[PDB]
């Protein structure tokens, strides 16, 4: 089995930007989630080969993970906060799509998503 190439973290054809909202997403949101005890499954792309998930990338066509998000934020890959927020939501939703509703990994994702929502509730006004 093979994994796909990971999502890109830089692209010279994609305009780059910094905003205070993106800074918040790095310094508050990602930082909070990354240090959590349940972060580890989400700190890098799903390794379908080592996890013995031959159907993962048959089901999940928009993979995303916090390692990718972190690199995107550090690289100023995003134009706006919405793009980054979408990547976090993709990550959580992928977990719920692939895994069974009662699974431990789903409970982990839910804990992280709750924190995510609490932090994005205070996303600053752009300025």
């Amino acid at each position: 089995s093979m994994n796909p190439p990971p999502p890109e973290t830089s692209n010279p054809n994609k305009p780059k930007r910094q905003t205070n909202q993106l800074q918040y997403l790095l310094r508050v949101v990602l930082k909070t989630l990354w240090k959590h005890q349940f972060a580890w499954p989400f700190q890098q792309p799903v390794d379908a080969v080592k996890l013995n998930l031959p159907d993962y990338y048959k089901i999940i066509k928009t993979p995303m993970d916090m390692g990718t998000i972190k690199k995107r934020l550090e690289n100023n890959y995003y134009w706006n906060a919405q793009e980054c927020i979408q990547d976090f939501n993709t990550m959580f939703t992928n977990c719920y799509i692939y895994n069974k509703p009662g699974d431990d990994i789903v409970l982990m994702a839910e804990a992280l998503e709750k924190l995510f929502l609490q932090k994005i509730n205070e996303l600053p006004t752009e300025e």
């Binding site: 996890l51 013995n52 998930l53 159907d55 895994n99 069974k100 699974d103 431990d104 990994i105």
Partner: peptide
């Protein structure tokens, strides 16, 4: 059985 971290589970 199929799934994350479940290969060695059988009941």
């Amino acid at each position: 059985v199929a799934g994350k971290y479940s290969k060695e589970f059988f009941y």
